[PDB]
């Protein structure tokens, strides 16, 4: 069980860790989060009390280094940093653990939610979508744009998701215009899976990462990407059986975790109605269709 210690909490802030969150008051003696489950990526995120503008946070994996948060009063945000002195980090964390200044990652033993939302998410892939190679952790916020959004404007601050465009030469073989537009199997299986992602696990990892950035930061371009990656599978007539069964599980837990009140801005009516009721895969997403119909019947 690893730890993200905090130097201090000089400004009032709502702190998120994965799907949990807690409020910290201005200058409250808060010094971090302990008992973080090893083996998954995690995200630690922030929403300032005085400016709900800009949710932001850091994707990290405690196996990759010792990370701590310190507020920067010049740039005005909580920054993640890596401690290279491992003896200093141990002594600092222990000091804080003994003074009971840390909150405990509040995981219920039976609860597989985070695993199910991050099953295929790897830090190495995150760091290729979020390019800042001098750090082992990745910053994301509400306002960062995707490479595809910027094509339709700071390149260093972009989310480099795989570009998916159903009306592009990449998606449409010359001489197969109708076939490839109406059945995207070529584009899914040959161009994207075999060509770009190499395997379905990397595809699903990017899909899950895009969903989490949409949910935790309201990042609009991430939501676009999540929906595009779902629609490309649902609009393919030929999808491996194991991918369809896994997608149903992936989506079920995404829909299950979504705040009931954010479904008006996080879910795209056209995509979901097409996927569940018209597409080739309308009959292959039984768990997702059942939770969607019981939780969000208005959208449909």
């Amino acid at each position: 069980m690893n730890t993200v210690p905090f130097t201090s909490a000089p400004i009032e802030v709502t702190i998120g860790i994965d799907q949990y969150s807690f409020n910290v008051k201005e200058n409250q003696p808060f010094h971090g989060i302990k008992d973080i489950p090893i083996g998954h990526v995690h995200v630690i995120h922030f929403q300032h009390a005085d400016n709900s503008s800009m949710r932001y946070g850091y994707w990290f994996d405690c196996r990759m280094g010792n990370f701590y948060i310190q507020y920067d009063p010049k740039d005005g945000l909580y920054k993640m940093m890596e401690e290279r002195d491992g003896a200093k980090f141990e002594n600092i964390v222990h000091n804080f653990k003994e003074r009971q200044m840390m909150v405990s990652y509040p995981k219920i033993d039976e609860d597989d939610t985070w695993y199910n939302l991050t099953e295929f998410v790897q830090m190495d892939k995150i760091r290729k979508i979020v390019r800042k190679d001098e750090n082992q952790f990745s910053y994301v916020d509400s306002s960062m744009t995707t490479v595809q959004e910027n094509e339709l404007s700071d390149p260093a601050h972009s989310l480099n998701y795989t570009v998916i465009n159903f009306k592009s030469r990449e998606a449409i073989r010359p001489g197969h215009e109708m076939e490839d537009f109406l059945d995207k199997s070529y584009y899914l299986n040959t161009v994207m899976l075999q060509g770009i992602f190499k395997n379905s696990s990397n595809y699903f990892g990017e899909l899950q990462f895009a969903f989490l950035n949409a949910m935790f930061f309201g990042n609009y371009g991430s939501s676009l990407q999540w929906h595009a990656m779902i629609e490309l599978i649902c609009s393919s007539a030929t999808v491996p059986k194991h991918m369809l069964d896994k997608l149903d599980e992936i989506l079920y837990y995404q829909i299950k975790t979504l705040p009931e009140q954010y479904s008006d801005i996080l879910l795209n009516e056209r995509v979901w109605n097409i996927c569940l009721y018209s597409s080739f895969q309308k009959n292959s997403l039984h768990n997702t269709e059942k939770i969607m119909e019981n939780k969000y019947p208005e959208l449909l």
Partner: protein, 237 residues
Amino acid sequence: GAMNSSNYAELFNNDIKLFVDDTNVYRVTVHKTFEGNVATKAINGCIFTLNPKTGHLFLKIIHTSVWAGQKRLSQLAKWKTAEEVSALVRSLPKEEQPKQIIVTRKAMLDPLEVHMLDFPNIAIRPTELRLPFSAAMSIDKLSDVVMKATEPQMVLFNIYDDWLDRISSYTAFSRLTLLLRALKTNEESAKMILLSDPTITIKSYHLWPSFTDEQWITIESQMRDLILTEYGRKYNV
């Protein structure tokens, strides 16, 4: 974006553009089978591709053999239309290729866009105008060439005959759409009007009769009266 009454004069500027109408591509007659079910039999169709500035009509005849063994023909018809329009564009010299293509029906937007991916600088536009190009098959010489075709074929026409020698494109297009609207709302009456005087003939190399300026004013008035009348005969006014 879309083409409407506000940007109407754009049709007659010097940017090459084409209207595409697919309403006569897939044509059928519905009939009963011996067992009392219903079946369709296809007849030859056509793509109606028109330069509104010059009158040049690119009439691509769609022979019934193109449907043989195919499913979802009304869907296929839109993609076949887009395949043929794209082939036409590719066949034209660069300086003759359109800058814009306006489809009369919005369901042609995605098929045409996809077939024209290679031409990113040709704009594919819909229109809010209700154009009467479905009535193209009420023009006897166009109907004749479509029904006689025994194989796929392209035939080239000028739908304005020689009108541009005397009138502008704007006026020629207005005349064409009045004639077609009339033929569409009451084909019998429209054709009665156009031929009633036997001294006025259709030249072998023309589609419409050889009316003088004054006789075209009379004809155009009679077509308006017809359209208004049908509008009353319809709604009772």
